[PDB]
Amino acid sequence: MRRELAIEFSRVTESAALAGYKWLGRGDKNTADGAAVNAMRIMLNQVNIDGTIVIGEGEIAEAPMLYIGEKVGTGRGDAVDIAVDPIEGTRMTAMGQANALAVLAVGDKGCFLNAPDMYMEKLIVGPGAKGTIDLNLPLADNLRNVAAALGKPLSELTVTILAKPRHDAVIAEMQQLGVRVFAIPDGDVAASILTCMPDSEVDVLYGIGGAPEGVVSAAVIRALDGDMNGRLLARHDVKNEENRRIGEQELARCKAMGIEAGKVLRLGDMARSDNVIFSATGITKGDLLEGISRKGNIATTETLLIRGKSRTIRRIQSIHYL
């Protein structure tokens, strides 16, 4: 009867996407965010769940809505963990650029790792390479094992990774290795799912991104029967002295939370059961989803709707009579 809620959750990302779409090309990241946050909360508060925000906009001091620990839903139905990413791609919404989307994941109570807002090294693959990765092994070793599971030469293997200065050395190493490297400007949530889409060239995601985004990836990767490892990393091992100010408070938040940074998290350490509903609606067109189009009174959305308990991946094209 939680599968009965799947449609309800797709309405939540549809509303959030449409609200961020109103601010497309308007040069205001905060107002576009606020609109999508606003709309996602409103909509969640009408769904029959007793949700706790486990991944969200920030702590209450910084985020007055969808803060970590916030209760959402009507309070009927199951106690559920909630992960929200109201706009994945806020900069691009403000700039009228590709790859903005609205994201939500719902799991069993206690399903999502409560990671602090810090960096996480990620390594993600699809179903055909499940059980063949380990971040305790060298990258090159990992890529070779993945290429063999996928049954392709290493030179064909496609690794997507965030285009950031921290990734220069590893990009040079992968290229030197003969791997194809898709260095993306955006963010790593949508990109991780490509590892599981047969029609994407992307086989693997590797690299350092946000820890909360990582758990959202872990939940959908789990639902899609792929694989992932992560590793939490404090700021000064990634990007100093202002970086160890903000980086020692990340390990402080870790210790009293209570997990250890620097240790390898397996898929099951991040997403703990298979009972995940994942919904994502495109705002602008990207690799995963089409964008919103509006011709006067009618808007269209595409939503990817994934349920862990099952044998079906849905793409829902909705025509909205605004």
Annotated binding-site residues read: 33, 57, 85, 88-90, 119, 164-166, 186-188, 210, 213
Q: Is residue 146 within 8 Å of residue 226, measured between CB atoms?
A: no
Distances (CA, A) of 228 to 3, 85, 175, 267, 309: 25, 20, 22, 5, 18
Task: Report the binding-site residues for substrate.
Answer: 88-90, 119, 164-166, 186-188, 210
d(CA 223, CA 274): 6
Taking the alpha carbons at both ends of the chain, their separation in whole angstroms is 30
The dihedral built from the CA positions of residue 49, 254, 205 and 37, taken in this order, carries a sign that is positive
Residue 25 tokens, joined: 């090309």
d(CA 99, CA 87): 10
Closest to 283 measured CA to CA, from 99, 31, 46, 32: 99
d(CA 279, CA 313): 11
Residue 24 tokens, joined: 């497309």
Residue 152 tokens, joined: 């392709």
Residue 130 tokens, joined: 């499940």
Beta-strand pair 298-307/313-321: antiparallel
- The angle formed by the CA atoms of residues 68, 39 and 290, to the nearest 5 degrees, is 105
Q: Which residue has the tokens 């404090």?
A: 234
Task: Report the binding-site residues for Mn(2+).
Answer: 33, 57, 85, 88, 213
Residue 201 tokens, joined: 């060239």
Q: Chain centroid to CA 130: how far?
A: 19
